[PDB]
C-alpha cells in the first residue's frame, strides 16, 4: 500500500499548509470511483502554480527530490515512487489547468482513497488529457492499461458528454 500511504502523507502535509492539491490521472479515476482498479506507475498531482515552492517543500520534508523539469510541470521522486506534477493557475473563482475545460480543479473533495476524501481533477479534465495522448500515440497502439482507464472514465462521465468534449477538442486544435 506504498502509494496510498504516500498519497495520504502528501495530502496531510498539504492540508496543514492550507495548500489544495488535486489527484490527477489514473489515481484520480480510482479516487472518483472509490475503488483501486489497477497498479499505477506513478501519482499525478495538480498544484497551485504560484505555490510550487510549498509543494517542493512537502516533497523534501518527505525525503524526496525534484528529478526532472518538464515543459508544463515537474517529476519528483520519494523513495521508489514517482510524482508527476503539473500546475494549475487561478482563474478568478477556481484554479484551472491551462487549456483544459472549465471546472478542472473543483474545490470540493470528490474522490475517496482508503477512506480519505480527496480533491481530484474533474472527469472532463481527466478525459481531455487522453485526447492529447491520442494525438501523440495512435489509440490503436495504446497500452491496454490506458485503453481500459480511458473507457472507465468515459463510462463514468457518459458517452454523450465524452462525444461533445472530443468534438470541442477537435475544434480547439483544428488547423
Ligand atoms: Cl511549474
Ligand atoms: Mg500517472
Ligand atoms: Mg504520469
Ligand atoms: Mg465538476
Consult the annotation and say whether 135 binds a ligand.
Answer: no
Q: Which three cell numbers stand for residue 60?
A: 523534501
Q: Compute the distance from residue 86 Cα to the ligand 1 centre, in Å.
A: 6
Give me the domain span that covers residue 106: 1-175
- The CA distances from residue 155 to 14, 30, 100, 148, 152, in Å, are 31, 13, 20, 11, 5
* Active-site residue flag, 84: yes
Contacts 24+ apart (CB under 8 A), 70-73: 72/98
From ligand 1's centre to the CA of 70, what distance in Å? 8
- Spot the catalytic one: 15, 30, 71, 84: 84
Query: What's the structural domain count of the chain?
Result: 1
The CATH number of the domain holding residue 162 is 3.30.460.40
80 is in an annotated binding site: no
CA of 137 to the centre of ligand 1 (A): 25
**Which ligand is in closest contact with the Cα of 123?**
4
Q: What is the resolution of this structure in A?
A: 1.5
Amino acid at each position: 500500500t506504498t502509494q496510498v500511504t504516500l498519497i495520504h502523507k502528501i495530502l496531510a502535509a498539504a492540508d496543514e499548509r492550507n495548500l489544495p492539491l488535486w489527484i490527477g490521472g489514473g489515481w484520480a479515476i480510482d479516487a472518483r470511483l472509490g475503488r483501486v482498479t489497477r497498479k499505477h506507475d506513478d501519482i499525478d498531482l495538480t498544484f497551485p502554480g504560484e505555490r510550487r515552492g510549498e509543494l517542493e517543500a512537502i516533497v523534501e520534508m518527505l525525503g524526496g527530490r525534484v528529478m526532472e523539469e518538464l515543459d508544463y510541470g515537474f517529476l519528483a521522486e520519494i523513495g521508489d515512487e514517482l510524482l508527476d506534477c503539473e500546475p494549475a493557475w487561478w482563474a478568478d473563482e477556481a484554479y484551472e489547468i491551462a487549456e483544459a475545460p472549465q471546472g478542472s480543479c473543483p474545490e470540493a473533495a470528490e474522490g475517496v482513497i482508503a477512506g480519505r476524501p480527496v480533491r481530484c481533477n474533474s472527469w472532463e479534465a481527466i478525459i481531455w488529457d487522453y485526447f492529447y495522448y491520442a494525438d501523440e500515440v495512435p489509440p490503436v497502439d495504446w497500452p491496454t492499461k490506458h485503453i481500459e482507464s480511458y473507457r472507465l472514465a468515459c463510462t463514468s462521465l457518459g458517452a454523450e458528454k465524452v462525444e461533445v468534449l472530443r468534438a470541442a477538442f477537435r475544434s480547439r486544435y483544428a488547423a
